[PDB]
Design a binder for this molecule. Structure first.
Ligand SMILES: Nc1nc2c(c(=O)[nH]1)N(C=O)[C@@H](CNc1ccc(C(=O)N[C@@H](CCC(=O)O)C(=O)O)cc1)CN2
Lengths: 315, 292
């Protein structure tokens, strides 16, 4: 239930110890947590703040087609992965704009700089969208989720389609204790723009219901987890659709669960709001495979959230 | 707390799902579970039944040094990895139809025979310390994670994976312990294990002591105190013929966990052997026997 998510935020506010982090933002953090969502009780898109489903859909579909270039996202007005690509670009020999070192913090502190970053970021998005040589070089994030799900590269010149294999094993071997997809590929991790935050997931089938457990090594509680929960709930629904199953539970297991220190007022504001009913997922009945779904084939209905709560992403 | 392990056994008895596999083996299972052991409260070797710690520690030591040859285990009277070696040998060319002992002696008293017949393949030692890459080099995940703990303790990337989808469909025993993660705060090291598949009566008690000991060994190597071992399960199943054993165990009063003692006069755990790891004040209820 949404309550389980809100209790996590509250526990971190109360007892999450301060921890320096890679991003230089600083976090309050706990280690080891588990939340369960019964998918039969509604689609888990949070109601205590508006969570944009279109972004969640486009990101999942991008994962599912095995794509690790941000061009596909930009064409669907999804900018959630922009900063890491832009970061690679501004560190490259080809960038010749104003200095962008530490842009992630500097935009919050210095408005003249915020305006330069907005200008450079606009030119970057334009070039990815319109210049295919530029897209190919600078849209690339390395072998992140899409690549490992669809195209885990083997030692003898091939690739494993892990996710398609797990879907097929659910159909013919539902009681398998190995229905696993891992994005943690030790060889590719160093050249990934980020190692996988949502790291490994496992399926389970009982009395015609499909459940999914995600192990998430690193969880951005305010900004990222709402996306992650909906993303894996959507995936479980797509797979249940293809395999002719009903949906069971999504179980979300966390390693370093953290609230960024500049998300604290936002989380507090969120905790002051009454929970509403989760919406309902609607999927196009005519699509057979998970890999056949496009944007128009997936919607959420009866979604009536409290207003958007804005917060800065830690780069 | 031991109470957390007992609560899992009780919940499985009360509401686990029954399944019968292709050969008649019944289980009661649930999916997605998490237990926490605060290692400052004592070392989680179960008190409601005797769990033999010798075998746990020679096994764990064997993984830690990345050894995949069973000679190290036999020297220490650990026989749990013997079948997928003796089975191999009797199907080889040089065999002629107790014979197990002749095999065990040769592994021990003949070097070449050990390399030829004592070598297991792709198991924990190899995955943790010697993960093969495309160009034929190797990543030592565990040694890397240790250095990261010393130099970058705030890291959210302290991960060791045992899961390669290239290798899994091919292996006799794909790893039950799929990955684990360390965490450091306030001078204390914690560890979370993700376990895809858990034999609740027979395996989980061994698994808990094994990862608790690992956390202690890494803490020792890194100059840290111990925090918690967090045990996350995927498919947690109680075999149908372990039900009476689980019920007997649940009838027994919990006692205080013992205290783990490591040789202080020895700096690196890569030089640890059996005598460097001790358990004090272990006072458990009797062994509960069960079909494997
Ligand atoms: N700091 C951080 N970096 C990360 C992640 C994360 O969760 N946190 N993600 C780990 O998965 C990936 C990116 N996922 C993201 C998900 C949401 C937003 C975000 O800013 N959402 C806002 C605004 C949405 C909009 O309208 O564009 C929001 O929800 O209000 C950013 C990145 C990779 N890097």
């Amino acid at each position: 239930m949404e309550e389980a998510y809100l209790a996590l935020g509250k526990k971190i506010l109360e007892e999450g110890h301060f921890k320096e982090d890679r991003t230089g933002t600083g976090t309050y953090s706990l280690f080891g947590y588990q939340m369960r969502f019964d998918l039969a009780k509604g689609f888990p898109l949070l109601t205590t703040k508006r969570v944009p489903f279109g972004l969640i859909k486009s990101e999942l579909l991008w994962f599912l087609k095995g794509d690790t270039n941000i061009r596909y996202l930009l064409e669907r007005n999804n900018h959630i992965w922009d900063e890491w690509a832009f970061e690679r670009y501004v560190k490259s020999a080809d960038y010749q704009g104003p200095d962008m070192t530490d842009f992630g913090h500097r935009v919050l502190q210095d408005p003249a700089f915020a305006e330069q970053y907005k200008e450079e970021h606009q030119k970057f998005c334009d070039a990815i969208l319109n210049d295919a040589e530029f897209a190919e070089k600078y849209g690339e994030l390395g072998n992140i989720y899409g690549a490992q799900w669809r195209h885990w590269e083997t030692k003898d010149g091939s690739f494993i389609d892990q996710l398609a294999n797990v879907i097929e094993m659910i159909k013919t071997n539902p009681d398998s204790r190995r229905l696993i997809v891992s994005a943690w590929n030790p060889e590719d991790v160093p050249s990934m723009a980020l190692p996988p935050c949502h790291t490994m997931f496992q399926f389970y089938v009982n009395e015609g219901k499909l459940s999914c457990q995600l192990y998430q090594r690193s969880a951005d509680v305010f900004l990222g987890v709402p996306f992650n929960i909906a993303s894996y709930a959507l995936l479980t629904h797509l797979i249940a659709h293809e395999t002719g199953l009903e949906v069971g539970e999504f179980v979300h297991t966390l390693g370093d669960a953290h609230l960024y220190q500049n998300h604290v007022e936002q989380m507090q504001e969120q905790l002051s709001r009454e929970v509403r009913s989760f919406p309902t997922l609607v999927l196009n009945p005519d699509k057979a495979s998970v890999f056949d779904f496009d944007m128009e084939d997936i919607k959420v209905e009866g979604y009536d959230p409290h207003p958007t709560i804005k917060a800065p992403i830690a780069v």
